[model samples]
Target chain A: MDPAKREAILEAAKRLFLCNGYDGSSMEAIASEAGVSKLTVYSHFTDKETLFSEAVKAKCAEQLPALYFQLAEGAPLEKVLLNIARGFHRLINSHEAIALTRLMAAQAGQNPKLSELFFEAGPKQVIDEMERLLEQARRSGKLAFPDARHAAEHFFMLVKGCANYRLLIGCAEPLDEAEGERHVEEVVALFLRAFAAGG
Target chain B: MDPAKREAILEAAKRLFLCNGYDGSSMEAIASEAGVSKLTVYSHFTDKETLFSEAVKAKCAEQLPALYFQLAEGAPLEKVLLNIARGFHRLINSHEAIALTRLMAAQAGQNPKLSELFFEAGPKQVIDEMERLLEQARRSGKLAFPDARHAAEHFFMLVKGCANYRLLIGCAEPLDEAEGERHVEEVVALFLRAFAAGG
Candidate 1:
């Protein structure tokens, strides 16, 4: 399969998976949606589970590129964090992510492996990367935390706060661009204070 | 109806609402589940919507009594905050809440009001009360955030951390009592540092 066809297949897989869930979305249907033969789908991804994991990874990477976690030498920490936060807030609040989250929540109890797979591919991956960044930040004296583990979780959780919860439950609208910036800045500042090395 | 019967109906409503969506759970079904007549269900809860709201409220109150927010005269701040954290963590991680959350997320896109009703009846109420408590804490010089609004959200979010996210998606089992206490203490410490009135 050509690169174009591979991209099309992954794109189609995401749309169908989000809309129809893991069991509901079949390989044949994904191939049809991508305008490729079923064989072409298998050519790109070995199996349906592989395709599902890649789709979740793709969605996360679309917003917070792995490179975003790399703390550039002397780069102002706030700028890098805002970049991460804006992408993260938007991604989690996006229609696609919310739909997929709902799908996962509904299916998780029954099909836990799928849930665990998604966790590793997406949320777990993002948090792990952030931990590395935080460790580097601590080493460079840009931030302070003895343990990067809980601190890493705290950073994203603060950036995320409860907007996703509100959005998930349908009580609030997604914050606009300006509001998102305000939120991320506030959260980053909170993290800075909580982990600050000295007064 | 007697108080016991009214309690039985509310209990049944919680069960059905978590198991079925708002649209799927009818008064007749709720009454049947509660072992009461349809008219008796109606008499107790004027409508399904009201029953749903009360159920959400009841669940929140079950874990976090309205009195929990009282901020008793001269009570130690850490003790009170830990109490809140423990309750909040358990409530959000409970199987019923997780199932109800999944039900709400799936139904939210189509029926925003049901989602909003649940939000108001539960999370919003919890946060607003927390905000009030924080404000009182700040006035007493026990906390130092300029605005209790965001700090209140921060407190709950930190206590919650990502355990609920893992639990909701079925990747992680619920934290046992000791593990839960450890988690809450760490979170409360993080919050205390973040909002410490003085160094």
Candidate 2:
């Protein structure tokens, strides 16, 4: 029951589940893929479903890091938000991340509970972090949001718009870094213009 | 085959394909569902695969209508673009429309051809229409877009951000009228703020 062994098992589960989907993948396959004993895999994760869910949760967390929002003092709202938006676009467009997203989306209709888990664990977490940043911006009088929740969702759409859809549909062309930067700048600047008071 | 019969076959094919999937729904089933003879369906569509592709195109065009862009002279660009966004949202969130999207997304990986038809016919068409809107807007000094293509895409992401993920994942409850209107307004406002030239 070593923590390192648990981490190894989860990583293996992620690889197998993403490549072969929920029903296609088996616990034995994960154990073999992870190079861990089947019993060890079971010790860390009781069942295939639990292991799959944990793997998705871990992957989502990795892709949606919160470090970008811990802005430095004197950071402009547009600058900070644009940085976070670009980071989010990069995260969603990664191969493993998109695979996990496609896997979840492909299964979401049949299994609505997993959809809830995805939103709460992934999008919800990101939104909470964004809310904190927007709250800071609001207090500074840099932006005025009547509803931070709605604004957070608006920001989420901006980031997810092209980046997520292209990846979800198997469009493998990587986004140009420059274009990503410009998109973030455009979206954030507009958001500020729309919501910022007396800027 | 009579044109009316051909139209009937396509309509029926659209419903069944959207309701079931390409693999799940059969040609015989479509014929039965459409109340046309199977031979008539075959005569018009050639095969099940062809039928599915055409159905996807027709249904997508229906769901994501483009009539709003043909606004009369002197109509403001803002009003025209906002109208398109509203119609697009209503179409995208409808029960049949969502189901169609789910079917295409689910089958895209498995059926490459169907996936191509869906995007080419759906989002791609929307992109073309938006580009036209932006082009005209630019001519009138309404919006400043360096690349009309990318700007059109950004505009879509803005609106789809509100509904696409929720609809794709089935977490979207039915949007009441007030919420729906508010969504269109907020998204359009953001779009205009980001893209519009100096007001």
Candidate 3:
């Protein structure tokens, strides 16, 4: 498969999957959307399931770059957390992300494998990275926690809080740049207050 | 309409809606499921939207209950919080509640009115009640917070945390009674540590 055509197929697959949901989008539709032949689509991804999983993985890589997961040496805890928060805010609040979330929720009952794949590719990956960061913070005496994984979960949950649910339910608008920045800042402050050493 | 018939219709409607989603289920199916005439279903709930809204409201009333919202005189803050957390955990973790949440998310974009109604009848009401309880706690010198509403949101968010999303995505199983109890205990402890007076 041509590398450029492969990228094109993934892009189209992501759009169609998010908009039309997993069962609703067909391989033919993806081929047409990507401006590629049906054979090309198959050659790139053997099946719709493969396409869907790759789409989710590709989106995660693009939105949550690998660099965000690795803490820089001598970086302040506040700075490291803020970086994670900003990346997370951007990724979760995007239109594509919201649509993908709705799509996953809709299909989760019927297609448990897809849901599992998505969990591994997206939320699980992010949580694992967060756990590493929290462990580092604990080692450096910046925070106190018996379990880094639980503390990491708490940090992201605080960042999400009610806003993510509101967005999912259509009760609130998407956060613009300024609002997103402010929201992340508040979440970071709260997490530090709750978990910082001797806090 | 007979009150007994109304109750039966609601029970059946809730089950059908949760199983088949808002758009997938119909009045005919609900009537059949309830062992009532189509006319009776219509008489009780003018339309599907009305039935959906009422179903959500009834579920909330049954799960949360009015008494949970009111902090009794001389009630310790931790006890009150634990009560609220347990109720919230049971409500959010139930199969019916998870189905309703997924239904709301799937239909939210297409039917803004239903989304708005669900928001007002469910999340908004619960949050309001929590805010009142937090205010009472603050007044009683059990907790300190500049914003009762934010604190209330934080409390529930911490309770929900990742577990709710895990269920929504079908990545995790529903919490058994023991797990639910443990979860609420941890959430209450975290909240108290964060907000208890002079902590």
Q: Of the pair 1 and 3, which is ahead by TM-score?
A: 1
Interface RMSD, model 2, angstroms: 2.4
Candidate 2 local lDDT, B110-182, one digit each (tens): 7656666567766777788878877877877778867888778777766766456776776667678788788
- Give the winner by lDDT: 1
Model 2 lDDT vs. the true structure?
A: 0.72
Query: Can you list each candidate's DockQ?
Result: 0.75, 0.52, 0.68
Task: Please say which candidate is ahead in lDDT: 2 or 3.
Answer: 3
- Give the alpha carbon lDDT tens digit for every residue of A1-199 in model 1: 4778878898888788766767888999999999999888888788899898888788789898888888888988888877888888887888888877876786776788888878888888888888888888888797877689788888778877788788877778888889888888889888888888764
| Cα displacement (Å) at residue A142, model 3 | 0.9
Q: What is candidate 1's CA lDDT for residue A2?
A: 76
Please provide, for model 2 over A10-113, each residue's C-alpha lDDT reduced to its tens digit, 9 standing for 90 to 100.
88777776668877889998889889888887887777756766766666566556666765578766667877777677777776666666777677668876
Sorted on DockQ, best first, the list reads 1, 3, 2
TM-scores, one per candidate? 0.93, 0.85, 0.88
Give the C-alpha miss distance for residue B132 in model 3, angstroms: 0.6
Over the true interface, candidate 1 deviates by an RMSD, in Å, of 1.2
Give me candidate 1's TM-score against the actual structure: 0.93
Positional deviation of residue A79's Cα in model 2 after best superposition, in angstroms: 4.1
lDDT (CA) for every model shown? 0.83, 0.72, 0.80
In model 1, which regions exceed 4 Å deviation? B18-24
Residue-level lDDT tens digits of model 3 in B1-199? 6878878888888777766767788999999988899998888788887887777777788878888878778977777788788888888878887876787777667876777878887888899989998898888898888889888888888888687788888878887789778777876877777776875
User: For every model in order, what is the number of clashing pairs?
Assistant: 0, 0, 0
